[PDB]
């Protein structure tokens, strides 16, 4: 009906709607990313990014790329230590950390899973507690010395 526009090359880890055989003048599409990824247009991470096709048959903007969700650094635990599930210290999407509790004077509450994985909402999470950190408790009645 108008002028035709180059078939779009989808982003890595990201959809495009609406998917069409051909694209024409006045048409407009939305670039999305998988669960756990946002769209990066230098230098900001948004949920969708939009482009139209112009009278001259070209796209209004180049296709952006999907940068992974990164929940930064796990919060410190008093009388506790953090250990990672990878040597490179991954903090990106779906990566796990185990909150250990310093021995032998402290133990963890409810002896919970103690594992924290990254939610796609960019947040370190535990399916028992949530965003709330574990609690490390004093160890009662266990003297290091016995009598002669």
């Amino acid at each position: 009906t108008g002028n035709e526009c180059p078939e779009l090359q989808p982003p890595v880890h990201g959809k495009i709607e609406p998917s069409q055989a051909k694209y024409f003048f006045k048409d407009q599409v939305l670039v999305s990313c998988d669960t756990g990824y946002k769209v990066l247009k230098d230098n900001v991470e948004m949920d969708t990014f939009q482009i139209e096709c112009l009278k001259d048959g070209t796209w209004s903007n180049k296709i952006p790329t999907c940068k992974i969700v990164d929940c930064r650094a796990p919060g410190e635990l008093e009388h506790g230590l953090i250990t990672f599930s990878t040597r490179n210290n991954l903090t990106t999407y779906k990566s796990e950390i185990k909150y250990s509790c310093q021995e032998p004077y402290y133990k963890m509450l409810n002896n919970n899973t103690g594992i924290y994985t990254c939610s796609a909402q960019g947040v370190w999470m535990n399916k028992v507690l949530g965003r709330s950190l574990p609690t490390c408790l004093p160890v009662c009645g266990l003297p290091k010395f016995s009598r002669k």
Partner: protein, 251 residues
Amino acid sequence: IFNGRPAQKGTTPWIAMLSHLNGQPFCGGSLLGSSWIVTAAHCLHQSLDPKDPTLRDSDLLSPSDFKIILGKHWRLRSDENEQHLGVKHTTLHPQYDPNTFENDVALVELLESPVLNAFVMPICLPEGPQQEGAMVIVSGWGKQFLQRFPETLMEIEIPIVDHSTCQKAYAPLKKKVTRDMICAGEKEGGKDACAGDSGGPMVTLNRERGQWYLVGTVSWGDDCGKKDRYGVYSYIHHNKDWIQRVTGVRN
């Protein structure tokens, strides 16, 4: 501690000393959780006037006027194991009776939590009641036989008496012995706590748990180590609910 044996350095890490800013001791205590000390209530108040046997804010010993010492062994001499700590609040039992001695238990909030180590660490709250004849251990820096003071912490290992046969002993001298109280000692007397032992703990070993539990604290007694008169202690399981309510301590 009458006819006692010197405590071995590190076998009683929960023991706490209640001493005036002066340094001079006056009661015992036991560390609960991270920043709490349990004691006898009467430790924490100046002797109420008999003309008005009721309690007042003005009667209670002030937080600024005493300190807590943890990891102490020598009665007067000092250590690098000692940790000197302030007092945020003190809380007596709401049904504590200064004249009857009922509910003779109180809690002291620490100002800064101590560094937990081999010589300093808490005792467990009792997860249940005590059987007749259970061997307990009682510890304190109190006056011993012949009325002198120790250089060290002193302890005694004694059986618990059944409440019934304890009551029968303190009647007909007409002194009440409530459920909140517990007795430890042998028929013919000989081993007891004494002056300067109040609040000092009475513990048991549990097996096959392998953990030491707090049973009760030094409360009162006739004289020290008298025949047919067992020493009375504050039963803790009876007031565990309150303690957990106040402190928020789970084992």
